[PDB]
């Protein structure tokens, strides 16, 4: 590990600097090094890990979609044959994306999830596991596609079960988990009705619990509620 010689606290400090500089690949590398120190992560450190990899993989996904669209058009009737290059380059980006997903899933399995006992940590990591299997599912085409989809589903479902027992309906992690699992249903599992039902029930149950919150917590929860509403508007 190239970060093995750097202090944990220095890695966290540099992750924060990398975020300020919009250097998300560096941010992710620093946070990988911090995880590999073997200690549990704090709430803020979990956010830094998630932000770093979300930005890295988000850029890869956007690029993959551009290239996949070009590849699809290149294969339509009437298109001029232009050789293997579009497929090759889409595959290059895809392999890099899969590598990042494998890295994140590897950190979660070795050994973040097994040491995560509080709901705020365990739900967060299980949500991440669902997210990175979902990104693998977005590009998957082989014998293991159904198992990749089921791995995402299983991680999200365990997170949901814990979140419903241990967190209030307005907890932002619970809300973000539901938002993302709803997207999984809609985009990955071909289950738009489940996606819509989950988003609606999540929104309504959060609405009913807002009265318990401080002004700052209300702002946090309503922000994620608005994303649920945005998706519902897209889908209905």
């Amino acid at each position: 590990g190239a970060m093995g010689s750097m202090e944990r606290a220095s890695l966290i400090q540099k992750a924060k600097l990398a975020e300020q500089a919009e250097r998300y690949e560096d941010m992710a590398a620093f946070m990988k090094g911090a995880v590999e120190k073997g200690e549990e992560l704090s709430n803020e450190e979990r956010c830094l890990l998630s932000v770093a990899y979300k930005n890295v993989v988000g850029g890869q996904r956007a690029a993959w979609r551009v290239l996949s669209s070009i590849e699809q058009k290149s294969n339509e009737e009437g298109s001029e044959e232009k050789g293997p290059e579009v497929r090759e380059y889409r595959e290059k980006v895809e392999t890099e994306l899969q590598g990042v997903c494998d890295t994140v899933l590897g950190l979660l399995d070795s050994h973040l999830i097994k040491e995560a006992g509080d709901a705020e940590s365990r739900v967060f990591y299980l949500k991440m596991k669902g997210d990175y299997y979902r990104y693998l599912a977005e590009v998957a085409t082989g014998d293991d596609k159904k198992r990749i989809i089921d791995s995402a589903r299983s991680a999200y479902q365990e997170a949901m079960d814990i979140s419903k027992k241990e967190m209030p309906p307005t907890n932002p992690i619970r809300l973000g988990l539901a938002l993302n699992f709803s997207v999984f249903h809609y985009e990955i599992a071909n289950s738009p009705e489940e996606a819509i039902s989950l988003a609606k029930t999540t929104f309504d149950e959060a609405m009913a619990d807002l009265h318990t919150l401080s002004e700052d917590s209300y702002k946090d929860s309503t922000l994620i509620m608005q994303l649920l509403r945005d998706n519902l508007t897209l889908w209905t």
Partner: peptide, 6 residues
């Protein structure tokens, strides 16, 4: 549209 996730 591409849906929101966090």
């Amino acid at each position: 549209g591409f849906p929101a996730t966090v």
